[PDB]
Structures are given as structure tokens and as C-alpha cells.
Amino acid sequence: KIYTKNGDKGQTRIIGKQILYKNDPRVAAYGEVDELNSWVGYTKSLINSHTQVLSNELEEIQQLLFDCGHDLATPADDERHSFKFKQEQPTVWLEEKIDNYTQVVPAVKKFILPGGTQLASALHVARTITRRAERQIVQLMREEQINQDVLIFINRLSDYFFAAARYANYLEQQPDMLYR
Amino acid sequence: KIYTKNGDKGQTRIIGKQILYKNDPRVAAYGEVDELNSWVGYTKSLINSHTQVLSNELEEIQQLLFDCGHDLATPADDERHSFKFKQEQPTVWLEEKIDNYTQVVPAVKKFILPGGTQLASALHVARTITRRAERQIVQLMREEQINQDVLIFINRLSDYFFAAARYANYLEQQPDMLYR
Amino acid sequence: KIYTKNGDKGQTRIIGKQILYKNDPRVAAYGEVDELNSWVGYTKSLINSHTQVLSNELEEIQQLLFDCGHDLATPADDERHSFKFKQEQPTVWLEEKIDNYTQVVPAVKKFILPGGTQLASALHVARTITRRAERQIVQLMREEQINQDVLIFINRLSDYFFAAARYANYLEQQPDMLYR
Numbered sequence: 001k002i003y004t005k006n007g008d009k010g011q012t013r014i015i016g017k018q019i020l021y022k023n024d025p026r027v028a029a030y031g032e033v034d035e036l037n038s039w040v041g042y043t044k045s046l047i048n049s050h051t052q053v054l055s056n057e058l059e060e061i062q063q064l065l066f067d068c069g070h071d072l073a074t075p076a077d078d079e080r081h082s083f084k085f086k087q088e089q090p091t092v093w094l095e096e097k098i099d100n101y102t103q104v105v106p107a108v109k110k111f112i113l114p115g116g117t118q119l120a121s122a123l124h125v126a127r128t129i130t131r132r133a134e135r136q137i138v139q140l141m142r143e144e145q146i147n148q149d150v151l152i153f154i155n156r157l158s159d160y161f162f163a164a165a166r167y168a169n170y171l172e173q174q175p176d177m178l179y180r
Numbered sequence: 181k182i183y184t185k186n187g188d189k190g191q192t193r194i195i196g197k198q199i200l201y202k203n204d205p206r207v208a209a210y211g212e213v214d215e216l217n218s219w220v221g222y223t224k225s226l227i228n229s230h231t232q233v234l235s236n237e238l239e240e241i242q243q244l245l246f247d248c249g250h251d252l253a254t255p256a257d258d259e260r261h262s263f264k265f266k267q268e269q270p271t272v273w274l275e276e277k278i279d280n281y282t283q284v285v286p287a288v289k290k291f292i293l294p295g296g297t298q299l300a301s302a303l304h305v306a307r308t309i310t311r312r313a314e315r316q317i318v319q320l321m322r323e324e325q326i327n328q329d330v331l332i333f334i335n336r337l338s339d340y341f342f343a344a345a346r347y348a349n350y351l352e353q354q355p356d357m358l359y360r
Numbered sequence: 361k362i363y364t365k366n367g368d369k370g371q372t373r374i375i376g377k378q379i380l381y382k383n384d385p386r387v388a389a390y391g392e393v394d395e396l397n398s399w400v401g402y403t404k405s406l407i408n409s410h411t412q413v414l415s416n417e418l419e420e421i422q423q424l425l426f427d428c429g430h431d432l433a434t435p436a437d438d439e440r441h442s443f444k445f446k447q448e449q450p451t452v453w454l455e456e457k458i459d460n461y462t463q464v465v466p467a468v469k470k471f472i473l474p475g476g477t478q479l480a481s482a483l484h485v486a487r488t489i490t491r492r493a494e495r496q497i498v499q500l501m502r503e504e505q506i507n508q509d510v511l512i513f514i515n516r517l518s519d520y521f522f523a524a525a526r527y528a529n530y531l532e533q534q535p536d537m538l539y540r
């Protein structure tokens with residue numbers, strides 16, 4: 001049974017031996033990353049023939065978000081479990097995509113209102129849920145030692161979702177609307 | 181008029197005579213349950229010919245979430261209003277579904293990335309919004325006496341959404357993807 | 361490059377010279393408004409031939425939410441930047457729509473469960489995300505001087521989304537379901 005009932009009184013296990021209240025900032029941080037991961041799954045389910053080129057990288061992001069969650073669930077002083085997430089390669093990978101998608105779409109200097117195609121709009125939702133998760137991670141960092149590589153990656157990831165959302169509109173030739 | 185303007189300065193009425201700031205943990209708790217309820221409505225709107233068997237129980241969950249919200253909005257010491265939510269029957273009902281859906285889908289021991297069909301992905305989003313609401317309920321419980329039956333049910337409900345999401349993928353023969 | 365990396369350590373610039381941690385209540389408040397704005401974009405992407413009459417006003421709301429975010433990002437004592445958002449005209453505009461949509465749909469005295477068509481369900485999600493943003497704005501207001509016009513408008517806006525959701529169901533002749 002996936003239901004153990006052990007969480008019925010409001011406490012839960014993290015990685016290692018510690019238990020925490022479910023509203024503890026650590027649990028909120030990796031919980032928000034799980035919410036983001038689920039939204040990325042939902043976004044991927046909206047891919048169509050015009051936007052197939054985005055499918056594989058969204059799946060890759062889901063794998064990465066699991067790695068980020070793992071590290072957020074791991075206390076820095078846990079002897080039996082180490083941080084596994086290293087920002088450099090995944091973050092450079094995001095930056096290459098951001099560069100490519102920024103270059104290819106029509107240039108703007110004005111704010112774009114988030115929207116357009118259903119997929120582009122979902123990528124803007126991903127952008128903002130990523131940023132909400134990021135706020136939670138910073139709340140955790142102010143109380144506990146974290147793997148700061150996760151913060152670097154999560155920061156860059158919301159720029160990826162912005163750039164990808166504009167690219168998704170481009171792929172269907174849907175214009176972005178500007179803030180008046 | 182549904183707009184009374186009484187909330188324009190940031191305070192609002194709960195059940196009974198009390199008013200609270202809108203960011204009070206009580207208001208946040210039943211507000212998050214309302215957000216979950218709206219997401220469940222959205223998820224139900226995605227039902228298709230393959231997944232019709234899930235429609236009625238999602239509606240039932242919406243009725244239950246209203247009952248949970250009511251109790252969260254009710255102070256334990258309110259003389260004129262009592263708790264109405266009793267966990268036993270609805271929670272056993274969820275567990276029977278969890279058992280049936282766990283049994284029928286392909287077995288895994290590895291983490292599944294949340295996604296697949298649009299409905300399954302939406303059920304994973306429901307899973308994570310349920311868990312966010314749960315965190316809020318625990319925040320409330322640490323400051324005020326609550327109907328702990330709501331916490332039991334909300335805990336079990338996110339396991340229901342996990343099991344139902346895998347079942348929704350099964351109903352369309354969409355494989356779950358595993359964490360590498 | 362849209363990625364400056366300046367946020368990689370958890371601090372960010374608001375309007376004017378101040379930097380704040382990303383979990384600061386000010387950043388959370390306008391961050392939640394950005395999340396709402398993205399959800400409004402997503403909702404607009406669901407418009408169909410039955411519901412085209414709702415498209416333009418959703419776009420207008422997105423423009424207004426940018427104005428609200430701007431003011432939330434602006435300290436009251438910032439000498440170089442002023443509040444731009446004035447509630448009266450946009451709020452009266454919302455109230456006229458609320459009146460018109462309340463009048464036209466079938467009357468109820470009982471709670472409606474949030475759902476129905478995909479668009480109506482998305483408008484209920486908008487309703488609840490608006491209310492979450494509102495809670496964040498009240499958290500900010502309790503610590504800092506804000507443009508209270510934003511709070512007035514955001515309060516009224518969740519009533520707009522309720523009324524519009526019922527109207528979206530009406531436009532497709534989808535009944536609302538009542539709480540038993």
C-alpha cells in the first residue's frame with residue numbers, strides 16, 4: 001500500500017532519519033519542486049505536431065527536477081546521504097537553449113504579456129511556478145545549509161521557460177502581445 | 181451583488197463571528213482547499229471517452245472538499261457551528277480506489293515522473309496541489325485546534341490522486357516514464 | 361542575454377534601488393500576480409467559438425495585472441518612481457461585468473462546485489489563484505505601505521472570475537453543479 005498513514009498527524013520523513021512537520025520550509029521547498037515537475041508533465045501533454053521539437057527537453061527537465069528535489073530533501077550534515085546535483089552541465093544546457101530561442105524569435109524591448117498558444121501559455125505558467133519554487137528554496141536557504149547548485153539551476157530554469165514560451169509561440173506563428 | 185466590498189481592507193469573515201486578515205493561516209488553509217477544488221473541476225473537464233469511469237468520483241471529491249473547507253473555516257470553540265466532516269467513510273472509499281488502481285496498473289519500484297496523458301498529468305497536478313493544501317492545514321494545526329479528520333482525509337487524497345493518475349495513463353495505454 | 365546570473369545567490373532588484381531576498385513578502389506578492397497573469401493567458405488560450413466574447417476582456421485584465429505588479433514592486437517611499445494604478449475605472453469596469461454576468465445566468469442560492477466546461481473550470485482556477493495572490497498582498501500590506509488600490513482591484517477581480525466562470529458555462533449551456 002502506498003498509504004502508510006504515518007503522515008496522518010502532520011509529520012513526515014525527509015532523506016535520512018529526520019522527521020519534520022509538513023509545513024517545514026524544507027518540505028515546502030521540495031514540495032514546490034514536485035508541483036513544478038507535475039506542471040511540466042502537464043505542459044508536455046500539450047505538445048502537438050508544430051511543437052514536437054520541445055518534447056524531449058521537457059522530459060529531461062523532469063529528470064533534473066527529481067535530482068533537485070532529492071538534494072533539497074537532504075540535510076547538509078547527513079552522513080549517509082550526499083548531494084548529487086551539480087549545476088554546471090544542466091545550467092549550460094539551459095543557457096544554450098535560452099540563447100538559441102532568444103535569437104530565433106522576433107526581438108522585443110517591451111514586456112510581453114504571458115500567453116498565446118496553449119503550449120506557450122503553459123510554459124509561462126511553468127515559468128511562474130518555477131519562480132514560486134525558487135522563493136521557497138530561498139526561504140529554506142535562509143534557515144539551513146542547502147546545495148546552492150539547485151538554486152542556480154532553478155533561477156536559470158525560469159529564464160528557460162520564458163524563452164521556450166516565446167519559442168512555442170514562434171513555432172505556431174502566434175504573435176506575442178506586448179504590455180501597452 | 182456578490183461584491184460586498186467588505187474585504188477591500190484585507191479582513192474577511194470566517195464561519196461564526198470572527199474576522200481575520202486574509203493571510204491568516206486559517207484563511208490560507210481553506211483557500212488552498214478551494215484552489216484544489218477548482219483544479220479538480222478543471223481535471224474533470226478533461227475526461228474523454230477512454231476515461232469516463234473517473235468522472236463521477238472526481239465530482240464526489242469536490243463535494244467532500246467543500247465539507248473539508250467548511251470545517252477548516254470553523255473555530256473549534258465556536259458554539260453555534262460544529263464540525264461536520266468525519267474521515268472514516270470517505271477515507272476508506274479513497275483507500276478502496278487506491279487499492280484497485282494500484283493493483284490494476286503495471287507494477288513499478290522506481291519513481292515515476294509525473295505526466296503522460298493530459299488527464300493523468302492533471303491528476304498529478306491535483307496530487308501536488310493537495311499536498312500544498314496539506315502543508316497549509318498543518319500550519320494552521322500548529323496554531324489552532326482543527327478537525328484532524330480533515331488532515332487524515334487530505335493526506336490520503338494525494339495518494340488517491342497518484343493512484344488515479346497512473347490509472348488514467350493505463351486507461352489510454354500510455355506508459356508511465358520512470359526516473360533514471 | 362535574459363540571464364544575468366545576478367539572482368543566483370537569492371537576492372533580486374525591485375523597482376528603484378532596493379534589493380530583497382526572493383522570498384521577501386514584496387517579491388512573493390508581485391510574483392503571485394505574475395503567476396495569476398500567466399494563468400489568465402492560459403485561460404484565454406482555451407477560448408472557443410462559443411466563448412469568443414470573453415477573449416478581449418481577459419487580455420485587458422492581463423494589462424491591468426501588469427500595472428498592479430508594477431505598483432506592488434514599488435516602495436511607497438521611492439522618490440524616483442510613483443504608483444500608477446488607480447482602482448476606480450478598472451474596478452467599476454469589473455463590477456459592470458459582474459452585474460451583467462450575474463443577471464444573465466441561472467439564479468442559485470447554493471454553493472456551486474467549481475467546474476463545468478474547460479474554460480469555466482479555468483476561470484475558477486483563476487478565481488482561486490487571484491485569491492491566493494490577494495492573501496500575499498495582505499501579507500505585504502501588514503509590513504509595508506502599499507497602493508491599497510491594488511488590493512481593492514484584486515479583491516473585486518476574484519468576484520469577476522466567479523461571475524465569468526458561470527457565464528462561460530452559460531455560453532456552452534453547461535449546467536453548474538451545486539454543493540449537496
Ligand SMILES: Nc1ncnc2c1ncn2[C@@H]1O[C@H](COP(=O)(O)OP(=O)(O)OP(=O)(O)O)[C@@H](O)[C@H]1O
Binds near residue numbers: 027030314339
Ligand atoms: N504535504 C506534503 N508536501 C510535500 N512533501 C510531502 C508532503 N507529505 C509528505 N511529503 C514528502 O513526500 C514523501 C512522500 O509523501 P507521503 O505522502 O508518502 O508521506 P506521508 O504523508 O508522511 O505518509 P502517508 O501519506 O503514507 O501517511 C514524504 O516521505 C515526505 O518526504
Ligand SMILES: Nc1ncnc2c1ncn2[C@@H]1O[C@H](COP(=O)(O)OP(=O)(O)OP(=O)(O)O)[C@@H](O)[C@H]1O
Binds near residue numbers: 188210253492518
Ligand atoms: N483571498 C482570500 N483567500 C481565501 N479565502 C478568502 C479570501 N477572501 C475571502 N475569503 C473567504 O471566502 C469567503 C468569500 O470571499 P469574499 O471574496 O466574498 O469575501 P470578502 O473579500 O471578505 O468580501 P468582498 O469580496 O465582498 O469584499 C469569505 O467570507 C472568507 O471566508
Ligand SMILES: Nc1ncnc2c1ncn2[C@@H]1O[C@H](COP(=O)(O)OP(=O)(O)OP(=O)(O)O)[C@@H](O)[C@H]1O
Binds near residue numbers: 134371382
Ligand atoms: N523567484 C522570483 N519570484 C518572483 N519575482 C522574482 C523572482 N526572481 C526575481 N524576481 C523579480 O522579477 C524580476 C525579473 O526576474 P529575473 O529572474 O530576471 O531576476 P534575477 O533572478 O534577480 O536575475 P537573473 O535571473 O538574471 O539571475 C526581478 O528583477 C525581480 O523583481
Ligand SMILES: [K+]
Binds near residue numbers: 002003004339
Ligand atoms: K503515502
Ligand SMILES: [K+]
Binds near residue numbers: 182183184185519
Ligand atoms: K465577494
Ligand SMILES: [K+]
Binds near residue numbers: 364
Ligand atoms: K533573468
Ligand SMILES: [Mg+2]
Binds near residue numbers: 156
Ligand atoms: Mg532569475
Ligand SMILES: [Mg+2]
Binds near residue numbers: 007335336338
Ligand atoms: Mg501523505
Ligand SMILES: [Mg+2]
Binds near residue numbers: 187515516518
Ligand atoms: Mg473578496
